[PDB]
Write a protein that binds this ligand. Structure first.
Ligand SMILES: O=c1ccn([C@@H]2O[C@H](COP(=O)(O)OP(=O)(O)O)[C@@H](O)[C@H]2O)c(=O)[nH]1
Ligand SMILES: OC[C@H]1O[C@@H](O)[C@H](O)[C@@H](O)[C@H]1O
Ligand SMILES: OC[C@H]1O[C@@H](O)[C@H](O)[C@@H](O)[C@H]1O
Ligand SMILES: [Mn+2]
Length: 279
């Protein structure tokens, strides 16, 4: 199988950081050859599960989410969508490519938006436990208020990954809106932190995502019993987890963007997965 030779003295991306200081790749266009990666993942018959919550009104976001995932997400690989919803009948029946399936998991609806967002960790954890284990190799956990606009593939796959929050990738850490109160399990001292990861897109092997979600859930319970809610809820706890358990890949903001709020800067060669306007 024949492709351009990587040249040691002529890096493709010179404008951005492409590896973290613990040697995890930062995934940007021009750092990867998808043909090589597709072959590596196909030879293992990799199955990717994608979890998405659509509780109450967010069922309205599923049709575009799913149609655009069919176009752009892991195309050519085996995919299992897990749609968590309080309204199984409102899931649109989208036609899927071969080797792709969708399961609907009915769950309860929490009243507050915070708890719906926060209780995802518990629900991914869940107990949807020996089920994710037998069914898929990797789990990808995303917001439903989104659409795919370009390739999201096996380049993201790794034991544990997070995604750079699009409104903080160019900032310094004291500007990061981590939880700064030490009463919270989510507390990160002001002199600490690598990146600000966004809550809408994380994943990894099933064992690592279960660890993560179990820890974030146990940490959120400790805070509740202590009468505190972290400033950005699950995102706060995700950031704390990924500080202490560093991801083995970091996705660039190509993988989580909002063209309406942020435009299309030159540093972004593709906008792959983006926010859909809402109230
Ligand atoms: O009433 C709700 C509130 C939240 N969510 C889920 O939790 C995610 C996070 O909430 P949201 O996207 O509202 O937060 P934002 O990204 O706007 O900060 C959503 O994408 C949905 O998957 C849901 O299904 N129904
Ligand atoms: O600072 C953290 C916050 O930043 C905002 O831009 C975003 O809308 C929130 O969802 C949260 O991520
Ligand atoms: O406020 C908490 C929320 O933060 C948003 O930025 C993120 O997209 C959501 O997944 C949720 O974590
Ligand atoms: Mn969202």
């Amino acid at each position: 199988m024949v492709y351009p030779q990587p040249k040691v003295l002529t890096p493709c991306r010179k404008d951005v950081l492409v590896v973290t200081p613990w040697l995890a790749p930062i995934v940007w266009e021009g750092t990867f050859n998808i043909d090589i990666l597709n072959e590596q993942f196909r030879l293992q018959n990799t199955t990717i599960g994608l979890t998405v919550f659509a509780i109450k009104k967010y069922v309205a976001f599923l049709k575009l989410f799913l149609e655009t995932a069919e176009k752009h997400f892991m195309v050519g690989h085996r995919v299992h969508y897990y749609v968590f919803t309080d309204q199984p009948a409102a899931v649109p029946r989208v036609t899927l490519g071969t080797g792709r399936q969708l399961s609907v998991l009915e769950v309860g609806a929490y009243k507050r938006w915070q708890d719906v967002s926060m209780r995802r960790m518990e629900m991914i954890s869940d107990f949807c436990e020996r089920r994710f284990l037998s069914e898929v190799d990797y789990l990808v956990c995303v917001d439903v208020d989104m659409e795919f606009r370009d390739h999201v593939g096996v380049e993201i796959l790794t034991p544990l990954f997070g995604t750079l929050h699009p409104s903080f990738y160019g900032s310094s850490r004291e500007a990061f809106t981590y939880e700064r109160r030490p009463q919270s399990q989510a507390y990160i001292p002001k002199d600490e932190g690598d990146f600000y990861y966004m809550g809408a897109f994380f994943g990894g092997s099933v064992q690592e995502v279960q660890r993560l979600t179990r820890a974030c859930h146990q940490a959120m319970m400790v805070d509740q019993a202590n009468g505190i809610e972290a400033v950005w809820h699950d995102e706060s706890h995700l950031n704390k987890y990924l500080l202490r358990h560093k991801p083995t890949k970091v996705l660039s903001p190509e993988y989580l963007w909002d063209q309406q709020l942020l435009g299309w800067p030159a540093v972004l060669r593709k906008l792959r997965f983006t926010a859909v306007p809402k109230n």
